[PDB]
């Protein structure tokens, strides 16, 4: 079998294949995650270079791993499917053996472990994908939001963004997100998430996707018109 060590150290102590995988993430469409007091919202950018697209059937950017946990990503689309499939299989395996669904931290720790493994295994390249994993632990009402990256490190975030122009939207979130008082309602959380994407997106038309996850497996994706109403209200307050 093909055994070649593709991920190796350089004289300055860097692993370039892992670092170049981060550059693939930088190219991907922007993704953002914001947790409120009783919810988490995942926002995603859709590049409008592709029209004549069939939006019914085209792969959506946010994926359910289980009924209570979701995963979004920035980077190579094909690579993300492999991580999503593995995560979905592990979620069902955990239910089968422990008789309890995965915690958000556990699912994150698993996906991050897979990513790390692909950085010191022979014959493979790292995943060109960073993920945002969000949801609620079983029988718990505390919101959870984690991030993973090609190296395999992971951590929890009050709010975070990944992908192209994520430096800009993180700037916005760092001055607009207060830890002592997070977005108290679904409305406030969705509004702050749409606002953060409008710093980067272009037209607020079919370019913004929003998914809301609440406790006890309550997950719903907002439609074009519902998001369009947030887009309308934000700019009418801005004209002042």
């Amino acid at each position: 079998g093909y055994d070649r060590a593709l991920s190796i150290f350089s004289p300055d102590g860097h692993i370039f294949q892992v670092e170049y995988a981060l550059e693939a993430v930088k190219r991907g469409t922007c993704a953002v995650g914001v947790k409120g007091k009783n919810c988490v919202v995942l926002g995603c950018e859709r590049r409008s270079t592709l029209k004549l697209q069939d939006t019914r059937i085209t792969p959506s950017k946010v994926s359910k791993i289980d009924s209570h946990v979701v995963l979004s990503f920035s980077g190579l689309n094909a690579d993300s499917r492999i991580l999503i499939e593995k995560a979905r299989v592990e979620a069902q395996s955990h239910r089968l053996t422990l008789e309890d669904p995965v915690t958000v931290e556990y699912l994150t720790r698993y996906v991050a472990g897979v990513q790390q493994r692909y950085t010191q295994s022979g014959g493979v390249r790292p995943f060109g994908v960073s993920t945002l994993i969000a949801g609620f632990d079983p029988r718990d009402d505390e919101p959870k939001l984690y991030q993973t990256e090609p190296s395999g490190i992971y951590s929890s975030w009050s709010a975070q963004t990944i992908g192209r122009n994520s430096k800009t939207v993180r700037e916005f979130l760092e001055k607009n997100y207060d830890r002592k008082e997070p977005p108290a309602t679904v409305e406030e959380c969705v509004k702050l998430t749409v606002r953060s994407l409008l710093e980067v997106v272009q037209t607020g038309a079919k370019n913004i996707e929003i998914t809301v996850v609440k406790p006890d497996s309550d997950i719903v994706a907002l439609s074009s018109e519902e998001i369009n109403q947030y887009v309308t209200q934000i700019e009418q307050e801005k004209q002042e």
């Binding site: 060590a5 190796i8 102590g13 472990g113 951590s155 709010a159």
Partner: protein
């Protein structure tokens, strides 16, 4: 290109030497061994204020009598910790006893040189392994990606290590109390950290014979930081 297991003209393995450079870029970790216990402390170093810092886990329990702190590419440490935990539990299963701290460390270091064309590269992380056993008392080890481990009375690893080690050279003596060691780790972490040290960007832990391995609460560490500030202002 060139082999992953190649020797340099000086008789050193290229990949091992390069991984040591990655460890120099890592966040600082310090350990101090006393006759009353061993203390372990780390710099958390969050990349952004929106990152919830209590999810940064750079101090980890291996068993009740053994703890561990890391510095470098911390993702690489996960399989090392997994192996260490498995080795500690497996030995207890086979021998109905606690495993010696040295024996645990040796088991972890056996993984290090298992790379080639096994894993594709060495680990990019260094570990401070602290613990207690009946035969050799309180112990602190430094496990490297070369497969070598040294025992230490005190040791610092990461980006601020050589400045910290010089400080540990002057401060350590064989009569240190546990309380004195706690303040000493905090003092030296504060010295080498970029940001100002508080209970949210630094973490303390210890291992004693009585209570075993414990990670300190942010409230407990905050008090020790206040105690440090006052005694430095006392002269």
């Amino acid at each position: 290109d060139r082999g992953v297991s190649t020797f340099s003209p000086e008789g050193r393995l290229f990949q091992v030497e390069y991984s040591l450079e990655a460890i120099k870029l890592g966040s600082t970790a310090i350990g101090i061994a006393t006759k009353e216990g061993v203390v372990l402390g780390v710099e958390k170093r969050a990349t952004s204020p929106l990152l919830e810092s209590d999810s940064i886990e750079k101090i980890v329990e291996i068993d009740r009598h053994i703890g561990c702190a890391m510095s470098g590419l911390t993702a690489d440490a996960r399989s090392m910790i997994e192996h260490a935990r498995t080795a500690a539990v497996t030995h207890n299963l086979y021998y109905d006893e606690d495993i010696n701290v040295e024996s645990l460390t040796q088991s972890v270091c056996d993984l290090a040189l298992r790379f080639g064309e096994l894993m594709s590269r060495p680990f990019g992380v260094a570990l401070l392994i602290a613990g207690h056993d009946a035969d050799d008392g309180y112990q602190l080890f430094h496990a490297e990606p070369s497969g070598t481990f040294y025992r230490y009375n005190a040791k610092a690893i990461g980006s601020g290590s050589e400045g910290a080690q010089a400080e540990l050279l002057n401060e350590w003596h064989s009569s240190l109390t546990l309380k004195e060691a706690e303040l000493l780790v905090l003092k030296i972490l504060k010295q080498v950290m970029e940001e100002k040290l508080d209970e949210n960007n630094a973490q303390l832990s210890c291992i004693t014979k009585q209570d075993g391995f414990k990670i300190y609460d942010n409230e407990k560490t905050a008090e020790l930081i206040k105690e440090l500030k006052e005694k430095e202002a006392a002269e």
